[PDB]
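CORE FACILITY INTAKE
Project code: CF-77B
Contact: R.S. (postdoc)
Sample description: multi-component assembly, two entities in total
Requested service: structural model of the whole complex
Turnaround: standard
Below are the sequence entries exactly as provided by the requester. Do not edit them.
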Amino acid sequence: MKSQFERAKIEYGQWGIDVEEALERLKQVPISIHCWQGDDVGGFELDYPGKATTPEELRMDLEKALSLIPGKHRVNLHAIYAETDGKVVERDQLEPRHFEKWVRWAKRHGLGLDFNPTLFSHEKAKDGLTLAHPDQAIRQFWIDHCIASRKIGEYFGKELETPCLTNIWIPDGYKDTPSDRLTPRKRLKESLDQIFAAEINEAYNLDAVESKLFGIGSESYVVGSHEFYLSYALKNDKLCLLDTGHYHPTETVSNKISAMLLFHDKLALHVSRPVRWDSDHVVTFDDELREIALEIVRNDALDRVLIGLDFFDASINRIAAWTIGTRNVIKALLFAMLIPHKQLKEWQETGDYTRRLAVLEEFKTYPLGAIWNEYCERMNVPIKEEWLKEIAIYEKEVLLQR
Amino acid sequence: KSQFERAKIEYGQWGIDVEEALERLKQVPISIHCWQGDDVGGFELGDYPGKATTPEELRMDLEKALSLIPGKHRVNLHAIYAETDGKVVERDQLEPRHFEKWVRWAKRHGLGLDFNPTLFSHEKAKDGLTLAHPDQAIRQFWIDHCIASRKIGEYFGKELETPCLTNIWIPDGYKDTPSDRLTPRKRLKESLDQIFAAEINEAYNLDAVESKLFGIGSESYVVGSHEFYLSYALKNDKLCLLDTGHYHPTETVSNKISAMLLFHDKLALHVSRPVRWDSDHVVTFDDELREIALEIVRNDALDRVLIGLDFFDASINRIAAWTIGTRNVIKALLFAMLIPHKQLKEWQETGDYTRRLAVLEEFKTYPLGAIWNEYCERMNVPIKEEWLKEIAIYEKEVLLQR
């Protein structure tokens, strides 16, 4: 087989694409994978079979997937994954102790940890408003929670010697047509001001705001819109986090990256396949994923774009969702590394649209597979479909016994 | 007129004061664009007949339309509308002297002027790049044209004692998939920086940037994107101009006003009807326009939102196009002012989504016509359809003879 790799490399090398430099480079990009795929977003507070229902089930499940995904990565956690020890602990009261085990496990595995406060599935979120709720006592609870979550993020970064991204997503909005779009937004601004009042060293923690266009039950209006967070983050030196499923029909995260890189040091990204609404299907190796990777790489933004997954498909093997999802994004970055950017750029500069079109096109049939397979061999994860066998045995022996 | 009086009582029962609304309405200026009158030809060195051919014709046509539009408004001029007395003047050499006849006309009619540099239909725009052209000599030339345009808007403001909005819209982009989305944008940023270097008093001039998603010739990519402009304008304390035809399918300006007023002092808005692309059909009294009006009125923003028209329809009478469109945005403002905000606000704060919905819906049949008709008589413009006569007469007696 390995001649295929040698032969593949001379094809890319005829363009001066150094595949050895690309693999060296790819090796180091971490992808933050999301814990909630493992237990259908259950968490530990107070239809496909085999989910995790237990911290020790979830960590094992994560290990299984990680061992099938080449490289070294991070795990992205939600506050409701706190380990309380059988004590009822309220969300405004969560503390570094409540994530001690996660941090120990991450250290053990060489992982980073990213965090999120949870502002859904909760008594105090029942009216569909949280940070932007009319009642001052509700807003304050959620504020205290977010502040607690930042503290927990600071804890992660200090402990793991890699900054944690603490991302705020709120569900706040209305099912139907609002009579006031201004007042809830105003309240959101005021809540976020208070959440970010205390400074945290950015070696330990970075904050992100995540917009959404609509959700089920928040259909006609959501408070934390794209224009809102884009202005807020820029005003207050915060990261925007972009979810490829959180935008308009035909709306493109690839088109935004480059523009944001001009005005923001760093940018955060959640990848998820939306199908007609924000369905959070599993990421696929598709045109827009390739296009994103091209922007990341082309723009020399590998350390500037913090790449994460977010999807929850309960219709298939969940270890498999993780392994497919993450291998696709890696494959896309690899493909983007294997593009002749200099010639493509020069062609664009000189108005040679004919060649720019032609080669972009011709590169879609370059031996990507052979480069992808060799990289899997060296990074000790199974090649091509062989990772399926590993999942089948773990389904039989572990998942199907639960 | 007793008809008016019964209507005033239906509204007054919610505590809406029609006389107060009418007096606020009378105050609001709408910026009417000159280029509808000559089909965007300008005066630089099949369809409906009798378009303006010369500035005197164009001014007559505008006077006519204005005579049918209730209130006191403004005219938005494009640089190609310079009067250069038979001389060729390059766009970078344009001075206030080339607009004194417009300013003398404006002053004599009590009109404000708004302005735009002209960055299209020119030898130096043939590649479909302008401020973002790879060639430094091209960029520099258009930079100079924009600077010179800011001085002209300054002239306007000094002269008319209302500040001029000088808006930048550029056609820059690529037909097909670009291989570099960042560098043209870095260039656009740099150009703009230069354009805005010289300070000018906000009493005389305000600058705005207009994002588009896409046009003919530029389908895949537009340098001056929404995200780009939003950040630019925020960092550099400049205005955003939103064009209701410049966005995604299902994407609304009405959902953005509230977010932007939370971070920008002032906003500009062009209204036009997009039919499936940025087609610039004549504005109609529709759902989104009403919803735009609602946002402006209920967010207290009648002095914060600079409202203008942008549309070029050649299939119908051009004076009618202005009178329909401006009459529609004024009609929509009136509509908004006659909505019981206080109660609807309070109901949302309360959770009474049933009354919010019911009542917004019942107001759809309130006697708007009777108020609108009274208004038009008070303001000395024909009522209902009767302005068609003046148009028919004008067409026979003037536009036939052209």
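Facility notes:
- The radius of gyration of chain A is 22 Å.
- Residues 82 and 167 of chain A are 16 Å apart (CA to CA).
Invoice: internal transfer
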